[PDB]
Design a protein around this nucleic acid. Structure first.
Length: 110
RNA sequence: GUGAGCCCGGGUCGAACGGCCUCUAGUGCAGAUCUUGGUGGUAGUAGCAAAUACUUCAAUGAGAACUUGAAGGACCGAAGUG
Protein backbone atom coordinates (compact mmCIF):
# COMPACT_ATOMS: atom_id res chain seq x y z
CA UNK A 1 0.00 0.00 0.00
CA UNK A 2 3.03 2.23 0.55
CA UNK A 3 5.01 3.30 -2.52
CA UNK A 4 8.78 2.92 -2.76
CA UNK A 5 9.50 6.65 -3.11
CA UNK A 6 8.20 8.20 0.12
CA UNK A 7 9.35 10.87 2.57
CA UNK A 8 8.40 11.07 6.24
CA UNK A 9 9.43 13.40 9.05
CA UNK A 10 10.38 11.73 12.34
CA UNK A 11 11.58 12.84 15.76
CA UNK A 12 14.59 10.81 16.91
CA UNK A 13 15.08 10.69 20.69
CA UNK A 14 18.87 10.45 20.78
CA UNK A 15 19.04 10.88 24.57
CA UNK A 16 17.98 7.33 25.44
CA UNK A 17 20.28 5.95 22.73
CA UNK A 18 23.31 7.93 23.95
CA UNK A 19 22.68 7.37 27.68
CA UNK A 20 25.94 6.28 29.31
CA UNK A 21 28.15 6.42 26.20
CA UNK A 22 31.83 7.37 26.51
CA UNK A 23 32.22 11.11 25.93
CA UNK A 24 34.67 10.83 23.02
CA UNK A 25 32.29 8.45 21.20
CA UNK A 26 28.92 10.18 21.62
CA UNK A 27 28.66 12.08 18.32
CA UNK A 28 29.94 9.18 16.11
CA UNK A 29 27.62 6.86 18.02
CA UNK A 30 24.74 9.27 17.34
CA UNK A 31 25.61 9.22 13.63
CA UNK A 32 25.42 5.42 13.69
CA UNK A 33 22.12 5.52 15.63
CA UNK A 34 20.65 7.85 12.99
CA UNK A 35 21.72 5.40 10.27
CA UNK A 36 20.26 2.46 12.22
CA UNK A 37 17.02 4.38 12.85
CA UNK A 38 16.62 5.17 9.16
CA UNK A 39 17.39 1.57 8.18
CA UNK A 40 14.79 0.26 10.64
CA UNK A 41 12.17 2.81 9.56
CA UNK A 42 12.59 2.47 5.78
CA UNK A 43 13.94 -1.06 5.27
CA UNK A 44 16.95 0.28 3.34
CA UNK A 45 20.49 -0.64 4.34
CA UNK A 46 21.86 2.22 2.20
CA UNK A 47 21.46 5.37 4.31
CA UNK A 48 23.03 8.70 3.32
CA UNK A 49 23.19 11.58 5.79
CA UNK A 50 23.09 15.23 4.79
CA UNK A 51 26.18 17.27 5.79
CA UNK A 52 23.91 19.86 7.42
CA UNK A 53 22.51 17.01 9.51
CA UNK A 54 26.10 16.06 10.40
CA UNK A 55 26.75 19.68 11.43
CA UNK A 56 23.59 19.63 13.56
CA UNK A 57 24.79 16.46 15.30
CA UNK A 58 28.27 17.91 15.88
CA UNK A 59 26.94 21.41 16.72
CA UNK A 60 28.03 21.39 20.39
CA UNK A 61 31.21 19.34 20.08
CA UNK A 62 31.80 15.63 20.41
CA UNK A 63 29.77 15.22 23.64
CA UNK A 64 27.00 17.81 23.17
CA UNK A 65 24.51 15.90 21.02
CA UNK A 66 20.91 17.20 21.25
CA UNK A 67 18.33 15.13 23.11
CA UNK A 68 15.84 15.17 20.23
CA UNK A 69 16.33 15.86 16.54
CA UNK A 70 13.74 16.32 13.80
CA UNK A 71 14.70 14.56 10.57
CA UNK A 72 13.19 13.92 7.15
CA UNK A 73 13.87 10.45 5.74
CA UNK A 74 13.25 10.17 1.99
CA UNK A 75 13.24 6.68 0.48
CA UNK A 76 14.31 7.18 -3.14
CA UNK A 77 15.21 4.97 -6.09
CA UNK A 78 18.84 4.09 -6.84
CA UNK A 79 19.10 4.66 -10.60
CA UNK A 80 22.80 3.79 -10.88
CA UNK A 81 23.58 0.68 -12.91
CA UNK A 82 24.87 -2.35 -11.03
CA UNK A 83 23.63 -1.22 -7.61
CA UNK A 84 23.46 -3.67 -4.73
CA UNK A 85 20.23 -2.14 -3.39
CA UNK A 86 17.32 -0.81 -5.44
CA UNK A 87 16.34 1.81 -2.84
CA UNK A 88 18.17 4.13 -0.47
CA UNK A 89 17.29 6.63 2.25
CA UNK A 90 18.46 10.25 2.44
CA UNK A 91 18.25 11.91 5.86
CA UNK A 92 18.13 15.69 6.30
CA UNK A 93 17.73 17.96 9.31
CA UNK A 94 14.42 19.84 9.47
CA UNK A 95 14.12 23.50 10.51
CA UNK A 96 11.43 23.50 13.21
CA UNK A 97 10.72 25.86 16.09
CA UNK A 98 10.89 23.06 18.67
CA UNK A 99 11.65 19.35 18.08
CA UNK A 100 9.47 18.42 21.08
CA UNK A 101 5.80 17.54 20.71
CA UNK A 102 5.80 16.43 17.06
CA UNK A 103 4.31 13.30 15.52
CA UNK A 104 5.60 11.34 12.55
CA UNK A 105 4.22 13.01 9.44
CA UNK A 106 4.22 12.15 5.74
CA UNK A 107 5.79 14.88 3.61
CA UNK A 108 3.76 15.80 0.53
CA UNK A 109 5.47 15.09 -2.78
CA UNK A 110 4.33 18.38 -4.33
C1' G B 1 71.29 -64.08 6.73
C1' U B 2 71.44 -65.25 14.39
C1' G B 3 73.09 -60.27 13.02
C1' A B 4 75.56 -55.79 10.91
C1' G B 5 73.48 -56.47 6.07
C1' C B 6 72.59 -58.69 0.95
C1' C B 7 69.24 -59.56 -3.19
C1' C B 8 64.67 -59.09 -6.09
C1' G B 9 59.65 -56.95 -7.63
C1' G B 10 56.64 -52.19 -8.36
C1' G B 11 56.98 -46.72 -8.85
C1' U B 12 60.00 -42.36 -9.90
C1' C B 13 64.25 -40.96 -12.69
C1' G B 14 67.93 -39.61 -16.27
C1' A B 15 74.30 -41.27 -17.33
C1' A B 16 76.79 -43.86 -15.34
C1' C B 17 77.84 -48.21 -12.05
C1' G B 18 78.80 -53.03 -9.86
C1' G B 19 80.76 -58.48 -8.38
C1' C B 20 85.59 -61.22 -7.01
C1' C B 21 91.21 -61.08 -5.16
C1' U B 22 94.70 -57.75 -3.48
C1' C B 23 96.09 -52.28 -2.14
C1' U B 24 94.70 -47.75 0.48
C1' A B 25 92.05 -44.31 4.09
C1' G B 26 89.82 -37.72 5.95
C1' U B 27 85.88 -45.34 6.48
C1' G B 28 80.50 -46.65 10.08
C1' C B 29 76.85 -41.68 15.34
C1' A B 30 71.56 -40.70 19.44
C1' G B 31 73.77 -38.02 22.62
C1' A B 32 79.22 -33.63 23.17
C1' U B 33 73.98 -26.67 27.08
C1' C B 34 77.07 -30.17 19.52
C1' U B 35 78.47 -27.39 14.06
C1' U B 36 75.53 -25.62 9.95
C1' G B 37 70.88 -25.64 7.68
C1' G B 38 65.79 -26.70 7.85
C1' U B 39 61.03 -27.64 10.67
C1' G B 40 57.23 -28.29 14.84
C1' G B 41 53.85 -27.93 19.53
C1' U B 42 53.11 -23.66 22.07
C1' A B 43 49.39 -20.72 18.64
C1' G B 44 45.71 -18.02 15.10
C1' U B 45 47.95 -17.56 21.32
C1' A B 46 50.62 -13.30 24.01
C1' G B 47 48.86 -9.05 22.31
C1' C B 48 48.92 -4.69 18.15
C1' A B 49 45.95 -0.09 25.25
C1' A B 50 51.55 6.80 26.70
C1' A B 51 51.21 11.52 23.40
C1' U B 52 42.45 13.91 24.53
C1' A B 53 39.23 12.57 18.32
C1' C B 54 37.02 11.88 15.26
C1' U B 55 32.36 12.63 11.70
C1' U B 56 29.29 13.88 6.74
C1' C B 57 28.97 14.24 1.34
C1' A B 58 31.36 14.08 -3.39
C1' A B 59 35.40 12.39 -6.51
C1' U B 60 39.27 8.62 -7.70
C1' G B 61 39.57 3.44 -7.77
C1' A B 62 38.98 -3.71 -8.37
C1' G B 63 38.96 -2.37 -3.43
C1' A B 64 38.93 3.60 0.83
C1' A B 65 38.68 4.76 8.89
C1' C B 66 44.10 5.99 8.07
C1' U B 67 43.90 9.23 -0.59
C1' U B 68 41.99 14.22 -2.21
C1' G B 69 38.28 18.48 -2.21
C1' A B 70 34.51 20.68 0.51
C1' A B 71 31.69 20.58 5.24
C1' G B 72 32.19 20.15 10.63
C1' G B 73 34.44 18.96 15.57
C1' A B 74 39.11 19.20 18.23
C1' C B 75 44.67 19.65 19.57
C1' C B 76 49.72 22.15 19.57
C1' G B 77 48.91 27.42 22.35
C1' A B 78 54.91 31.62 20.62
C1' A B 79 60.48 27.49 26.40
C1' G B 80 54.82 25.39 19.82
C1' U B 81 52.90 19.85 16.97
C1' G B 82 55.16 27.35 14.23
Amino acid sequence: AIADVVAREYTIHLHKRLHGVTFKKRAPRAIKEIKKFAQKAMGTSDVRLDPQLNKKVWEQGIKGVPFRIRVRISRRRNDEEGAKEKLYSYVQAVNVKNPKGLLTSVVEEE
